[PDB]
Amino acid sequence: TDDKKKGKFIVFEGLDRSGKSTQSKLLVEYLKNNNVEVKHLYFPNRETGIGQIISKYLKMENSMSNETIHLLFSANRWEHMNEIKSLLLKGIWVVCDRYAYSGVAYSSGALNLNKTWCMNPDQGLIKPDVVFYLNVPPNYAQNRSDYGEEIYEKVETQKKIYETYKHFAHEDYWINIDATRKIEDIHNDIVKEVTKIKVEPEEFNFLWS
Amino acid sequence: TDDKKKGKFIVFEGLDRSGKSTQSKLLVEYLKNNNVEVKHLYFPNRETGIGQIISKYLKMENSMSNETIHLLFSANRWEHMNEIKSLLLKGIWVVCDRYAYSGVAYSSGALNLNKTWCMNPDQGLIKPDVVFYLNVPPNYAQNRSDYGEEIYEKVETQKKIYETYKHFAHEDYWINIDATRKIEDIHNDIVKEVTKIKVEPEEFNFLWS
Ligand SMILES: Nc1ncnc2c1ncn2[C@@H]1O[C@H](COP(=O)(O)OP(=O)(O)O)[C@@H](O)[C@H]1O
Ligand SMILES: Nc1ncnc2c1ncn2[C@@H]1O[C@H](COP(=O)(O)OP(=O)(O)O)[C@@H](O)[C@H]1O
Ligand SMILES: Nc1nc2c(ncn2[C@H]2C[C@H](O)[C@@H](COP(=O)(O)O)O2)c(=O)[nH]1
Ligand SMILES: Nc1nc2c(ncn2[C@H]2C[C@H](O)[C@@H](COP(=O)(O)O)O2)c(=O)[nH]1
Ligand code: NA
Ligand code: NA
Ligand code: NA
Ligand code: NA
């Protein structure tokens, strides 16, 4: 009856097209190489029933009130908690593009919802060991593949989101990484910060502690 | 640029198969007769994308974590706020089977979620003028048409839900109605309590004030 967290849980955050996927795949490949068992997840997961509606929303194929889409994103997060506990419990690590901090930055920055009201439903989600924030200025990524395809990918929106991410900018678990560099440079900083991680089984923590 | 609430907003609450639909249809028919324009709504609304998943959940055709289904119910509530404001603004009344109080009683009573965590996401929903609680004891309705068809319709669950409804039992807007009587008796009590309602345009209020 051991229910200690054995794996470590790592989150990449950032504006749209900031290299989250690139970096998280790199981190994953590096951990498989160094023999850590690891599982790559991401939010939103567009493949569930809730995910499908989220996806129609991001493509501007439907529309919905600000409150409804926020709660759907949060529900999509909650449908992964058993899977996430499961893995962590098994000592498999979890590397995830996006988490609840996306809730605040996007729902509070782009959709102007109250910050506290946005955080409430995500309260009690599993807390990660570290979040890497791939920091790029609001106008930086407008030229990368496909940008502007989904609803929030306009620089003026990216500005507000960028401003709203600051709400976590000075937290302990939060590591600003300059993502205006070469892929390999970003990657080594991440690997370096990952190596400074304690490997011991511990208790789970929960948002927003 | 008038944005006063003109209509009145009435909610029926109660355990499963307690006569909500019966009473709300009666109230509606009575208001059309006395020449009030009125719109009958209900939650969950199973016809939207979110509604469809809620519906699969109640039929036990899928399953999901407690947190996810709660947030879907709350999202389903939020997708009706524009429609509800719209009507109230126009002076059309709204009579509704079920609202956010169902969130507490069901999510907190049957699914054992924390009461405050359940209320948070519904905070900011339009507050109704009155809630009629069709009060029946937990074992009372087990013999009415079709009972036991959906997930919460087992007396042991109805017990907890019944206990959890008490959280509103002593509030101002909340009117206990003995629903163990004849349809016509229940109806006259409701009509009598409805006639004691002030007809004047006012400001909107919001949950959980
Ligand atoms: N550091 C970088 N330099 C140049 N191109 C990059 C860099 N990082 C990512 N890209 C490219 O920019 C686009 C966005 O990358 P991606 O990992 O999918 O971002 P995100 O997950 O944030 O949406 C992709 O085409 C990716 O190849
Ligand atoms: N007071 C009553 N006496 C006898 N039968 C009733 C009474 N009220 C409702 N019913 C019947 O019991 C069942 C549940 O009624 P309904 O209005 O659909 O409940 P609810 O909306 O709470 O699910 C229906 O068959 C209804 O006709
Ligand atoms: N409003 C809001 N948007 C979110 C939330 N989580 C993710 N998003 C947005 C961020 C991205 O613009 C978008 C698409 O995701 P992607 O390309 O995978 O990072 O979803 C959330 O919780 N709230
Ligand atoms: N857990 C939970 N259940 C709800 C909520 N709202 C409604 N329900 C349940 C109450 C009823 O059992 C069920 C079916 O609705 P109905 O027959 O229309 O009253 O939905 C909610 O917010 N949370
Ligand atoms: Na994106
Ligand atoms: Na991505
Ligand atoms: Na029911
Ligand atoms: Na009903």
Tab-separated table of C-alpha atoms in Angstrom, chain A residues 10-152:
chain	number	residue	atom	x	y	z
A	10	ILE	CA	7.336	18.577	-15.470
A	11	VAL	CA	5.257	21.195	-17.318
A	12	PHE	CA	6.172	23.424	-20.182
A	13	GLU	CA	4.362	26.716	-20.399
A	14	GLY	CA	4.458	29.525	-22.937
A	15	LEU	CA	2.796	31.599	-25.608
A	16	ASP	CA	1.639	30.028	-28.832
A	17	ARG	CA	4.343	28.553	-31.080
A	18	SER	CA	7.033	29.172	-28.489
A	19	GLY	CA	8.684	25.661	-28.894
A	20	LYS	CA	6.828	23.762	-26.045
A	21	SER	CA	6.380	20.725	-28.207
A	22	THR	CA	9.903	20.888	-29.514
A	23	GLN	CA	11.419	21.193	-26.065
A	24	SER	CA	9.163	18.635	-24.460
A	25	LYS	CA	9.910	16.082	-27.135
A	26	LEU	CA	13.680	16.812	-26.634
A	27	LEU	CA	13.372	16.420	-22.872
A	28	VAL	CA	11.519	13.175	-23.406
A	29	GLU	CA	14.112	11.748	-25.831
A	30	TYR	CA	16.858	12.757	-23.398
A	31	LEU	CA	15.205	11.000	-20.478
A	32	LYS	CA	14.653	7.791	-22.468
A	33	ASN	CA	18.362	7.918	-23.342
A	34	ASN	CA	19.350	8.382	-19.692
A	35	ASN	CA	17.094	5.519	-18.983
A	36	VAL	CA	14.225	7.325	-17.170
A	37	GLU	CA	10.831	5.917	-18.034
A	38	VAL	CA	8.659	8.822	-19.150
A	39	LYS	CA	5.280	9.708	-20.678
A	40	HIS	CA	4.566	12.740	-22.831
A	41	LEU	CA	1.109	14.345	-22.261
A	42	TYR	CA	-0.399	17.667	-23.278
A	43	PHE	CA	-3.354	19.930	-22.728
A	44	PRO	CA	-5.833	20.325	-24.063
A	45	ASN	CA	-6.184	16.766	-25.025
A	46	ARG	CA	-8.368	17.219	-28.098
A	47	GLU	CA	-9.191	13.534	-28.512
A	48	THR	CA	-11.811	13.135	-25.681
A	49	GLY	CA	-15.453	14.243	-25.933
A	50	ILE	CA	-14.562	17.412	-24.023
A	51	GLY	CA	-11.384	17.783	-26.104
A	52	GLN	CA	-13.366	17.713	-29.358
A	53	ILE	CA	-15.449	20.721	-28.312
A	54	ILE	CA	-12.354	22.526	-27.099
A	55	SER	CA	-10.858	21.824	-30.492
A	56	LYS	CA	-13.875	23.191	-32.385
A	57	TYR	CA	-13.605	26.246	-30.204
A	58	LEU	CA	-9.910	26.906	-31.017
A	59	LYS	CA	-10.566	26.534	-34.745
A	60	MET	CA	-13.380	29.057	-34.540
A	61	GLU	CA	-15.811	26.336	-35.740
A	62	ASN	CA	-18.108	27.061	-32.759
A	63	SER	CA	-18.251	29.751	-30.189
A	64	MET	CA	-19.261	29.700	-26.461
A	65	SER	CA	-19.281	32.030	-23.439
A	66	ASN	CA	-15.941	32.728	-21.739
A	67	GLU	CA	-17.020	30.859	-18.594
A	68	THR	CA	-18.020	27.732	-20.484
A	69	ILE	CA	-14.824	27.316	-22.467
A	70	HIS	CA	-12.736	27.909	-19.286
A	71	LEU	CA	-14.619	25.219	-17.463
A	72	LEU	CA	-14.239	22.843	-20.354
A	73	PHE	CA	-10.445	23.366	-20.292
A	74	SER	CA	-10.430	22.683	-16.587
A	75	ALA	CA	-12.619	19.614	-17.007
A	76	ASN	CA	-10.229	18.355	-19.737
A	77	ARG	CA	-7.373	18.798	-17.163
A	78	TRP	CA	-9.357	16.790	-14.570
A	79	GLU	CA	-9.974	13.856	-16.893
A	80	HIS	CA	-6.190	13.161	-16.765
A	81	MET	CA	-5.663	13.092	-13.015
A	82	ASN	CA	-6.112	9.317	-12.650
A	83	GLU	CA	-3.725	8.671	-15.500
A	84	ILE	CA	-1.252	11.116	-14.022
A	85	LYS	CA	-1.423	9.737	-10.507
A	86	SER	CA	-1.123	6.221	-11.922
A	87	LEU	CA	2.122	7.033	-13.752
A	88	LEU	CA	3.714	9.057	-11.051
A	89	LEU	CA	2.888	6.261	-8.631
A	90	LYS	CA	4.610	3.800	-10.878
A	91	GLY	CA	7.704	5.990	-11.013
A	92	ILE	CA	7.150	6.947	-14.650
A	93	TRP	CA	7.846	10.646	-15.128
A	94	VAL	CA	5.340	12.985	-16.837
A	95	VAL	CA	6.300	15.722	-19.235
A	96	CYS	CA	3.355	17.847	-20.242
A	97	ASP	CA	2.832	20.793	-22.659
A	98	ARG	CA	0.534	23.162	-20.860
A	99	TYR	CA	-1.239	22.965	-17.576
A	100	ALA	CA	-3.490	25.065	-15.305
A	101	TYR	CA	-1.230	28.067	-15.578
A	102	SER	CA	-2.500	28.202	-19.166
A	103	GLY	CA	-5.985	28.550	-17.546
A	104	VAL	CA	-4.999	31.836	-15.882
A	105	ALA	CA	-3.005	33.254	-18.685
A	106	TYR	CA	-5.490	32.458	-21.376
A	107	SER	CA	-8.830	32.706	-19.574
A	108	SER	CA	-7.798	35.711	-17.517
A	109	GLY	CA	-5.647	37.441	-20.161
A	110	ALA	CA	-7.454	36.876	-23.437
A	111	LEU	CA	-11.024	36.338	-22.206
A	112	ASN	CA	-10.790	38.783	-19.316
A	113	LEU	CA	-12.190	36.472	-16.680
A	114	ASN	CA	-11.427	37.129	-13.016
A	115	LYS	CA	-8.143	35.442	-11.966
A	116	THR	CA	-9.510	33.868	-8.808
A	117	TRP	CA	-12.644	32.544	-10.459
A	118	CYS	CA	-10.400	30.929	-13.142
A	119	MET	CA	-8.122	29.282	-10.546
A	120	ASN	CA	-10.864	27.821	-8.404
A	121	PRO	CA	-11.818	24.853	-10.486
A	122	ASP	CA	-8.193	23.799	-11.082
A	123	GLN	CA	-7.569	23.862	-7.350
A	124	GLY	CA	-6.753	20.237	-6.329
A	125	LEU	CA	-5.077	19.277	-9.575
A	126	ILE	CA	-1.725	17.510	-9.016
A	127	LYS	CA	1.035	20.063	-8.591
A	128	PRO	CA	4.092	19.711	-10.790
A	129	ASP	CA	7.735	19.486	-9.584
A	130	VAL	CA	8.737	22.246	-11.965
A	131	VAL	CA	7.330	24.414	-14.790
A	132	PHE	CA	9.645	25.615	-17.534
A	133	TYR	CA	8.390	28.784	-19.017
A	134	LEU	CA	9.523	29.198	-22.564
A	135	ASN	CA	9.672	32.962	-22.604
A	136	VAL	CA	9.280	34.804	-25.893
A	137	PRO	CA	8.049	38.345	-26.396
A	138	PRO	CA	4.456	38.730	-27.734
A	139	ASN	CA	5.477	39.508	-31.338
A	140	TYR	CA	8.309	37.005	-31.538
A	141	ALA	CA	6.608	33.870	-32.905
A	142	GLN	CA	4.253	35.333	-35.596
A	143	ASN	CA	6.438	33.945	-38.335
A	144	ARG	CA	6.734	30.297	-37.271
A	145	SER	CA	4.832	27.608	-39.235
A	146	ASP	CA	1.002	27.949	-39.402
A	147	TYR	CA	0.719	30.738	-36.749
A	148	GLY	CA	-2.651	32.572	-36.809
A	149	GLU	CA	-4.547	29.392	-37.553
A	150	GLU	CA	-6.220	29.215	-34.096
A	151	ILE	CA	-8.206	31.733	-32.052
A	152	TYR	CA	-5.612	33.259	-29.752
